[PDB]
Ligand binder design. Sequence first.
Ligand code: ROC
Lengths: 99, 99
Amino acid sequence: PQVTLWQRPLVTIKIGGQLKEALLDTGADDTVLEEMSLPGRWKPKMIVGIGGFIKVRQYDQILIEICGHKAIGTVLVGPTPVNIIGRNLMTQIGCTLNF
Amino acid sequence: PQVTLWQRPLVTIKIGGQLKEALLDTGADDTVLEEMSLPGRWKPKMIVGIGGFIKVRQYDQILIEICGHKAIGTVLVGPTPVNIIGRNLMTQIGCTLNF
Ligand SMILES: CC(C)(C)NC(=O)[C@@H]1C[C@@H]2CCCC[C@@H]2CN1C[C@@H](O)[C@H](Cc1ccccc1)NC(=O)[C@H](CC(N)=O)NC(=O)c1ccc2ccccc2n1
């Protein structure tokens, strides 16, 4: 459906057997979730945003359901004040901007 | 038109008599442009993103053309590595996410 932007575009994702709210971020290249326990092997990684860098744990081949749509991809876990769904998973579910 | 997200959603804006590329960011509450000269009176402001805070100059009632669509609103100028069009101006031009 058409999600307008008067308020933040938040949605519910299910990942790691848990339900969470997340922000559909067309400006985030990656998907970054708050600290949590995930099944798998991870690598350290450094990412950067407006204020500088944060170190996150990279997870690959993670199944994540975004509003009921299964998607598999790389998830970054770390100190983000808010769970962010980046363009990587959004393209998989078919999201897009309308102008 | 429907802007997909395989690559970054960049567009051309015209502001301050100049043409610039900017990112359509559904995850940014505000609009933040790289340091530039703007016509007006400004207030200092602190904003925060993934890595922490940055101090920006707030400008109000600024006319900014996004891909030819005039919009008037508050612009934040400061040390951002990339010009960001936030949800504030996007709602004015009628942008929205399609799921
Ligand atoms: C997540 C990551 C992969 C690191 N990518 C990014 O962070 C990219 C980096 C890009 C290049 C540098 C300039 C910014 C763009 C867009 N950002 C995405 C971009 O969408 C980013 C996502 C975000 C949201 C909340 C908190 C942190 C980060 N938004 C922001 O940084 C905007 C800044 C603004 N416009 O006011 N912040 C917020 O709108 C915002 C909202 C709620 C908050 C709650 C607590 C703390 C901070 C909060 N910040």
